[PDB]
Design an enzyme around this catalytic site. Structure first.
Site, PDB file in Angstrom:
ATOM      1  N   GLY A 136       1.122  -1.255   0.228  1.00  0.00           N
ATOM      2  CA  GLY A 136      -0.061  -0.204   0.282  1.00  0.00           C
ATOM      3  C   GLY A 136       0.842   1.354   0.045  1.00  0.00           C
ATOM      4  O   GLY A 136       0.127   2.422  -0.318  1.00  0.00           O
ATOM      5  N   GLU A 246      23.167  10.358 -21.212  1.00  0.00           N
ATOM      6  CA  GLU A 246      23.378   9.874 -21.968  1.00  0.00           C
ATOM      7  C   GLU A 246      23.175   8.251 -21.663  1.00  0.00           C
ATOM      8  O   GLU A 246      23.000   7.271 -23.606  1.00  0.00           O
ATOM      9  CB  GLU A 246      25.021   9.999 -23.388  1.00  0.00           C
ATOM     10  CG  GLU A 246      25.313  11.034 -23.729  1.00  0.00           C
ATOM     11  CD  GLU A 246      24.361  10.884 -25.011  1.00  0.00           C
ATOM     12  OE1 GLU A 246      24.443   9.817 -25.673  1.00  0.00           O
ATOM     13  OE2 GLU A 246      24.139  11.427 -25.615  1.00  0.00           O
TER      14      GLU A 246
END
Ligand SMILES: CC(=O)O[C@H]1C(=O)[C@@]2(C)[C@H]([C@H](OC(=O)c3ccccc3)[C@]3(O)C[C@H](OC(=O)[C@H](O)[C@@H](NC(=O)c4ccccc4)c4ccccc4)C(C)=C1C3(C)C)[C@]1(OC(C)=O)CO[C@@H]1C[C@@H]2O
Ligand SMILES: CC(=O)O[C@H]1C(=O)[C@@]2(C)[C@H]([C@H](OC(=O)c3ccccc3)[C@]3(O)C[C@H](OC(=O)[C@H](O)[C@@H](NC(=O)c4ccccc4)c4ccccc4)C(C)=C1C3(C)C)[C@]1(OC(C)=O)CO[C@@H]1C[C@@H]2O
Ligand SMILES: Nc1nc2c(ncn2[C@@H]2O[C@H](COP(=O)(O)OP(=O)(O)OP(=O)(O)O)[C@@H](O)[C@H]2O)c(=O)[nH]1
Ligand SMILES: Nc1nc2c(ncn2[C@@H]2O[C@H](COP(=O)(O)OP(=O)(O)OP(=O)(O)O)[C@@H](O)[C@H]2O)c(=O)[nH]1
Ligand SMILES: Nc1nc2c(ncn2[C@@H]2O[C@H](COP(=O)(O)OP(=O)(O)O)[C@@H](O)[C@H]2O)c(=O)[nH]1
Ligand SMILES: Nc1nc2c(ncn2[C@@H]2O[C@H](COP(=O)(O)OP(=O)(O)O)[C@@H](O)[C@H]2O)c(=O)[nH]1
Ligand SMILES: [Mg+2]
Ligand SMILES: [Mg+2]
Lengths: 428, 86, 428, 428, 428
Positions: A136, A246
């Site tokens: 939860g 990158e």
């Protein structure tokens, strides 16, 4: 200069965070009392006005019990108590409780702490999430958080190490529900997503390390080694350094397909290590072995859309391009057609560190692999079946619609699970 | 302001002009105590009260109420977010 | 946080709580004088769930003891641990119960509820984060059934959000210590279904066998039966009290166990259990702990799980172990006796664990399961109810307190619908 | 040359004074006995013929029960008894008893104490009032006094630090009555008036210092810090020295609009001081936080007509220029069109000094933010509401008309507020 | 300063006065010989409020003892604390009161007031700044009611500015120790309303319950009842006697409690109240003291608060505590029971606080409330009066003292007018 903000949500997140932040403080000489007897740690620490180094992490939870343990554990002299967040009540594996009812009233506290944590960094590489899907707090709150993050920055990259509900081993009964509700809500906000499962790593402990008593600690140990090898380029030297920018762009071709696997090698005790010499090839071979993965996903049923290899210790680039050439010649591996390339390799010169009283052994070479494959839809398909298997019966639903949810979200998230699954088929 | 308070203020002004000399507000038999102790050192026979000396100070008013403890047990109350009180 | 308020109703309920509040009082290392004399900090870390602070560093239990005929409340107060109870937490009436549900719920109920409700609120505010209620019943008697259901209804209308556990002891199928027993049972079940979230049903018969076969007891007093109920009642809340690599609040057990609002009738059991002899032979391993609980004897309720089908289940372990063992153990059982489980639920078990073992022991477990075999009980009682109601036996007593016959008809129907529900999801 | 006259009317006034004059003797080394073992104290003292330094203050009150405590406290050797004024009877929370019947007979006394104190000061910077609105003394008398002041000086500057009746927390039933009456009369007399309230500071002790048992003595230490950092340039060196004249000309654009809020930063305990660096950017952001205010107002519900900053400790002028640029960039903060500027800053090189037994910790940096915002008119609207909410019933009015007042002043105090409220709306 | 003179009328008033003077004589630590034997200086700073100096370092109370039938005055003289009263502070007559309000207020009252007024004038002038008066009535008997009111009317027309208290014990609604009691009640009320400023009302029946349920006393004698009246009567004035972070003179309690001149009948309660057993378990915190005081049982008057709303209330604490807690406690109570207060009064509680607690305790408090529940009390009497006056029972005694019937009709109508005003402000 180059900094990351490690977040730990749910129980598993604050569990592994104990391991990683044990590893780093060990790797850089940081004593548990803040200080050590530049930029080698600024990626993970903030030297105070004098001496102390505070780790730039954050611990979130709704169960007070675990964050209380760190408060009384040995590493209480490291964390500014502003970081360790808790809650009077927990979520009890209900998504709505962690997302609709309780989550909303505390995120203003977290984003306050985060706003106080990003301004300190001059160049923020990105956030680092340790989620626990199936509960939860992890699913409910974590999703609620990422929306609050992307509405704030957007331009920033979001990376997520989430544990995924393992198909066989299932500690919960309702975890398909909140997992489904999580994946939908998180997808459009996270830029990349790595998923790991505990059951796979359990088998890894068995074959290689040979420990018939695997606990949540040992699993949390291994993740620390993986991430330590990943951030290695960010906080160390070495040819072919890699940065998140990158790294992410050469790995996610399409905005939706950012779900990826992982692998590490070598993974050996102190005895087998003595009867071995650890050439780069066998490490890369094991790293591409489907068994050595950390997910219960078989890559030999799909193709590799891309792949990234982060080595460690003593490696030379000519050994890399040779070993990778041993792979692209193999037939057992498959790739998609629209990429002749697909290997973004990185080297670093600092060997992996070992933890005293830990399970790993001292090795001067180490490789971690991260690949994006279309085969991952297989384990995505299981959750597709289990949902309607219980949604037709509308089991446990009276909780959700009683905790500030409706029935649309079940159907709405349902379609995007279908939608995603077809996307994994369109790349075929 | 009034006669009583003006007399009060004049007495307090006198108290401030005079040096309090960190006084002890009670003087017992100083040299008698010293002489009795010297008699005990050698003669080995002195009355007990002659050996004794007593000194008092102001201490304070407010006769030692027990502490309030200013703090609960760190298992009941938490700060705002999970966190002890200090 | 998570402070829990406890109730004790009837003779039995007032009597088992004497053990429950005696066992836990020694777990956390406090003395009959109310002061703490343990050794670790942990007994103080979550001590707040069961106690309140006091002058001179004392801890009094957060329990409420209600019973007409205050004779027995002298017993507990003369019991070796009666000195710790707040004497203002003793609600009693001089007039006896009479085993009449009506006066226990219609005339004499209204006289004490206003008093009790002043008490329950007086310490409901004392909790920073009240987790929920819990109560110990006896459906046979007049105080237990009558008062509690009347009391339960009032609590539900002011604390509807919280959860109402129920350790009710059920009448026996074969033994009837009283005569009008089914009447009070049905008239309580007509109240339990609508005003409860979890209802553990237990019967002293299986309590007698488990005392006979396993523990090899020659003469079990009621102190030993209650000694068992104290164990399992102290076995549920190890998560809220102690650390654990996988903790389990009550509210997550509830969601993980009842898929529907009316299937909240459960079945419990403890593990391990052994005489002094075989304890010198037996070895404590997680395989031992899981077969003994999965067996069809340890079920404290007088029901055979093999006749029905496990909708959901759970297991609560305490003791240092490897959780993968627990993970694979529960996986095996879900495979072997695959007919005792349902299909529309992929994994119908929850596997919790605590890092803190019992006092003198080092490993232990606890079972819980929501099977449809429990409908067997409501079948039996329905016969006893309909037999006498067919002839209106002992019925004038009930009408003597303003009651009418309709309340019996609907109470009968509600069980009939209830037992009907347990049939649908029991597809044999 | 540069000295100030600090008056303390009412209980809260002289209470806060018991903290300010506690802090100053420590800031300058003055022992509690008047004498230490130039111009560093003349602003707050006046060396006698030999040795002692008397604090150039005035302690005024009608309740003897608190002034007589300083008369016997440790700080009696500091004050010449001719300073501490008392009275046989008090005002009893009636504005009329403070302003009409009793206050009329002792102003001539204090006015001679001032006249005996202004003459000693060569360059009189300005008075320094500590009013506590909500009582009879602070409101009724303090307002009567300032009338007698502006007829003497007029051209001189009368400051004010008036605690205001908090919206939620309030310890008087009639204080909406006197508060309105006080403002209706002080406004046209004073030229600048700082405003604050208790609860806004109660929370700060809970949020930042984390003390669950704050008393009036804790808030008083924080009011001590606000003033010290304000008046340091009057007594210390530093770039951008600030004087009351130059503090006043560029903060009150219109004669009526002179009320303003306050703030202070950093506010942290000792343990939170070691896991930090406290950059000038951190403080100016914490200073601009609407939660760090000392008044329960929402600045984001209005704009900033003007702002002011008095830093402290180790600062350089460029970073303030940088940080203030960052503040003007954010969008949460607004400024009215007719003020492009609005930041008149200031530095001193003397750090803030901490008091032993205090709650704050040692810091080499600090900021005190004062700003005139049009958002403050909302809290005036509360008192605007409660007044007519009771004046409709003419409740308690028999006290006022029974003590040398009539209904005219109420109606006439009424109109001034509506006229003042519209003024805050004419700026937009 | 703030000295107060004390009067005792009637037998009961002379008896509770024997305790009030015995409790206070121990508080400030003086002996039955009248000599001081305390330890601190707070025993002496404001001792003059209750005593006059005497030759030889003795202290005698500023008390007056008025009662016919001097038999009672031998008792109080013979008690262990009779030797402190000046034997000429005893005015009496040989003739009896006979419970006939007339002779106590017309014939035998007029014979003594000229002597009493001589005595009260003598020690009204023994005070530097006389704060006010206070009496001890018993609205049943003829001395208390008859002489008390006649005395009060005399004081009012002589010391109008001063304030008159009244600790009048009202008759009981269920219990009537006399028979002409309602005649003595109504006739006295026709005097008090116009000739008083604050009038506590107390009933022995509620004093029996408080001693029965809470104190768990088996046999409450009149001493214990008097022991409680003594307790509260001291609690009203600790501000005038002892230092306090928020002191409350009696005139500021007035203005904060009686918005209209006629609604000056209060309702009082004391706390903490426990037995000897509960004293061991209960902990002394602000929460306990405020829930106990806000309970409908501690109200020593025979009135139910829940049948009305608090126009205004006030709580007085004594004991080293935190002012924030008491500030929010009165806030929460004002929020939850919003039906138990009014709307046109925003904040209708005042929370004073003192610094010195009672003798052997460490925290204590006192509750005073001006609720419209008291209107019940006058309703009841107005029936018993109009019951017998409709039959002219016992009225011939009252015509026997030059009275008439108009005196009754006017008196009754005064209450019906009064209780009408308590309904107007009770909008149910
Ligand atoms: C030398 C040794 O190991 O002795 C054991 C022992 O042999 C056995 C037989 C114990 C023993 O229990 C019984 O004999 C027994 C009798 C009637 C009903 C139930 C038990 C033991 O009494 C029980 C006791 O267990 C505990 O203390 C638990 O922590 C338990 N405590 C209590 O029940 C308790 C006892 C006294 C006062 C207050 C509480 C507990 C259980 C659940 C939750 C918290 C605590 C221990 C280790 C033993 C003895 C003494 C023989 C067993 O019980 C428990 C509770 O462990 C019975 O089956 C187990 C297996 C144990 O090995
Ligand atoms: C060990 C201990 O703490 O004993 C207490 C005690 O247990 C209790 C039960 C005391 C005790 O009071 C009674 O037993 C009692 C009996 C009949 C009627 C009223 C009280 C105590 O007598 C009362 C007494 O309290 C005081 O002395 C107060 O300061 C009180 N004193 C008197 O009234 C007094 C005057 C003259 C001679 C003797 C007592 C007081 C209250 C207001 C203003 C001034 C003084 C003390 C501490 C105790 C005992 C002795 C048991 C209690 O009384 C008070 C007012 O403190 C009853 O409820 C309180 C709670 C206390 O805990
Ligand atoms: N490998 C590994 N898995 C863990 C660890 N801790 C927890 N997990 C897994 O996390 C899952 C449970 O997630 P939780 O964090 O407890 O659920 P939640 O989101 O916090 O919701 P609540 O329980 O209501 O607080 C389980 O399936 C665990 O297997 C750990 O330390 N290592
Ligand atoms: N921050 C702070 N506020 C205080 C303090 N003491 C009192 N106050 C508040 O100041 C207001 C009343 O101040 P007083 O001086 O007692 O009132 P007064 O002006 O003397 O008028 P009278 O009571 O009639 O004499 C209340 O709102 C108090 O809560 C204190 O020590 N610190
Ligand atoms: N586990 C346990 N059960 C008991 C005990 N005593 C009674 N019971 C059961 O309690 C049932 C009657 O409940 P009781 O409280 O006496 O009637 P009530 O007062 O009208 O509610 C009986 O059927 C008993 O079997 C005991 O000591 N231990
Ligand atoms: N608390 C207390 N009340 C008393 C005591 N004695 C009498 N009372 C009540 O006081 C009333 C009688 O008043 P009393 O002074 O005796 O008659 P009077 O002389 O005509 O005024 C009756 O209602 C008595 O119940 C006592 O000793 N203690
Ligand atoms: Mg969890
Ligand atoms: Mg005041």
């Amino acid at each position: 200069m180059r900094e990351v903000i490690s977040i730990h949500i749910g129980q598993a997140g604050i569990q592994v965070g104990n391991a990683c932040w044990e590893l780093y403080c060990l790797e850089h000489g940081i004593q548990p009392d803040g200080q050590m007897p530049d930029d080698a740690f600024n990626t993970f620490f903030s030297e105070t006005g004098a001496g102390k180094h505070v780790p730039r992490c954050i611990f979130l939870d709704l169960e007070p019990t675990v964050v209380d343990e760190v408060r009384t554990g040995t590493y209480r002299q490291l964390f500014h108590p502003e970081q360790l967040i808790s809650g009077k009540e927990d979520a009890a594996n209900n998504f709505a409780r962690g997302h609709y009812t309780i989550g909303k009233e505390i995120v203003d506290l977290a984003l306050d702490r985060i706003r106080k944590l990003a301004d300190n960094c001059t160049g923020l590489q990105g956030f680092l999430v340790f989620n626990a899907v199936g509960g939860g707090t992890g699913s409910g709150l974590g999703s609620l958080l990422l929306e609050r993050l992307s509405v704030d920055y957007g331009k920033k990259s979001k990376l997520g190490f989430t544990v995924y509900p393992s198909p066989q081993v299932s500690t919960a009964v309702v975890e398909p529900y909140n997992s489904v509700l999580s994946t939908h809500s998180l997808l459009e906000h996270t830029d990349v997503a790595v998923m790991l499962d505990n059951e796979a790593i359990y088998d890894i402990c068995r074959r290689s390390l040979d420990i018939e008593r695997p606990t949540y600690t040992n699993l949390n140990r291994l993740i620390a080694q993986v991430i330590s090898s990943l951030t290695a380029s960010l906080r160390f030297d070495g040819a072919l350094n890699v940065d998140i920018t990158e790294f992410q762009t050469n790995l996610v071709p399409y905005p939706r397909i950012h779900f990826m696997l992982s692998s590490y090698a070598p993974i050996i005790s102190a005895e087998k290590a003595y009867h071995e010499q650890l050439s780069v090839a066998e490490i890369t071979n094991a790293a591409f072995e489907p068994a050595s993965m950390m997910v219960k996903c078989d890559p030999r049923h799909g193709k590799y859309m891309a792949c990234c290899l982060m080595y460690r210790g003593d490696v030379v680039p000519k050994d890399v391009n040779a070993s990778v050439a041993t792979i692209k010649t193999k037939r057992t591996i498959q790739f998609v057609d629209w990429c002749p390339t697909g290997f973004k390799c990185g080297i670093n010169y600092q060997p992996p560190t070992v933890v005293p009283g830990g399970d790993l052994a001292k090795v001067q070479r180490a490789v971690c692999m991260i690949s994006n494959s279309t085969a991952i839809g297989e384990i995505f398909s299981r959750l597709d079946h289990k949902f309607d298997l219980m949604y037709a019966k509308r089991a446990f639903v009276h909780w959700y619609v009683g905790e500030g949810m409706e029935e649309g979200e079940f159907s709405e998230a349902r379609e995007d699970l279908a939608a995603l699954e077809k996307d994994f088929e369109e790349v075929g | 302001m009034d006669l009583k308070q003006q007399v009060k203020n004049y007495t307090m002004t006198i108290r401030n002009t005079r040096p309090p000399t960190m006084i002890k507000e009670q003087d017992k038999s100083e040299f008698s105590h010293f002489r009795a102790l010297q008699v005990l050192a050698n003669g080995d026979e002195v009355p007990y009260e002659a050996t004794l000396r007593n000194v008092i100070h102001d201490g304070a008013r407010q006769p030692k109420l027990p502490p309030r403890q200013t703090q609960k047990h760190p298992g009941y109350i938490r700060n705002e977010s999970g966190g002890f009180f200090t | 946080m998570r402070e829990i308020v406890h109730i004790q109703g009837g003779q039995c309920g007032n009597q088992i709580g004497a053990k429950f509040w005696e066992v836990v009082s020694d777990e956390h290392g406090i003395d009959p004088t109310g002061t703490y004399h343990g050794d670790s900090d942990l007994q103080l870390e979550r001590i707040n769930v069961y106690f309140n602070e006091a002058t001179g560093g004392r801890y009094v239990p957060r329990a409420i003891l209600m019973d007409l005929e205050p004779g027995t409340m002298d017993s507990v107060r003369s019991g070796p641990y009666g000195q710790i109870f707040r004497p203002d937490n003793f609600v009693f009436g001089q007039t006896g119960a009479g085993n009449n549900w009506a006066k226990g719920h219609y005339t004499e109920g209204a006289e004490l509820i206003d008093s009790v409700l002043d008490v329950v609120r007086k310490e409901a505010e004392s909790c920073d984060c009240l987790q929920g209620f819990q109560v110990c019943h006896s459906l046979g008697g007049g105080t237990g059934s009558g008062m509690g259901t009347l009391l339960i209804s009032k609590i539900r209308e002011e604390y509807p959000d919280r959860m109402m556990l129920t350790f009710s002891v059920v009448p026996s199928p074969k033994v009837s210590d009283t005569v009008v027993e089914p009447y009070n049972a049905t008239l309580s079940v007509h109240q339990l279904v609508e005003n409860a979230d979890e209802c553990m049903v237990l019967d002293n018969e299986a309590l007698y066998d488990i005392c006979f076969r396993t523990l090899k007891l020659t003469t079990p007093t009621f102190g030993d039966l209650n000694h068992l109920i104290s164990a399992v009642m102290s076995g549920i809340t190890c998560c809220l009290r102690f650390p654990g690599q996988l903790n389990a609040d009550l509210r997550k057990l509830a969601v993980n166990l009842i898929p529907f609002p009316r299937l909240h009738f459960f079945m419990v059991g403890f593990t391990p259990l052994t005489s002094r002899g075989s304890q010198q032979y037996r070895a404590l391993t997680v395989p031992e702990l899981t077969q003994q609980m999965w067996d069809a004897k340890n079920m404290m309720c007088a029901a055979d799980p093999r006749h029905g089908r496990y909708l959901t289940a759970s297991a609560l372990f305490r003791g240092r172990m490897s959780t993968k063992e627990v993970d694979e153990q529960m996986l095996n059982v879900q495979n072997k006796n695959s007919s005792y489980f349902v299909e529309w639920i992929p994994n119908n078990v929850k596997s919790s664990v605590c890092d803190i073992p019992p006092k003198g022991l080092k490993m232990s477990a606890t079972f819980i399961g929501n099977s449809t075999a429990i409908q067997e009980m409501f079948k039996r009682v329905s016969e006893q109810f309909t037999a006498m109601f067919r002839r209106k036996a002992f019925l004038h007593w009930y009408t003597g307190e303003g009651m009418d016959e309709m309340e019996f008809t609907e109470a009968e129907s509600n069980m009939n619908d209830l037992v009907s529900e347990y049939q649908q999801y029991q597809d044999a």
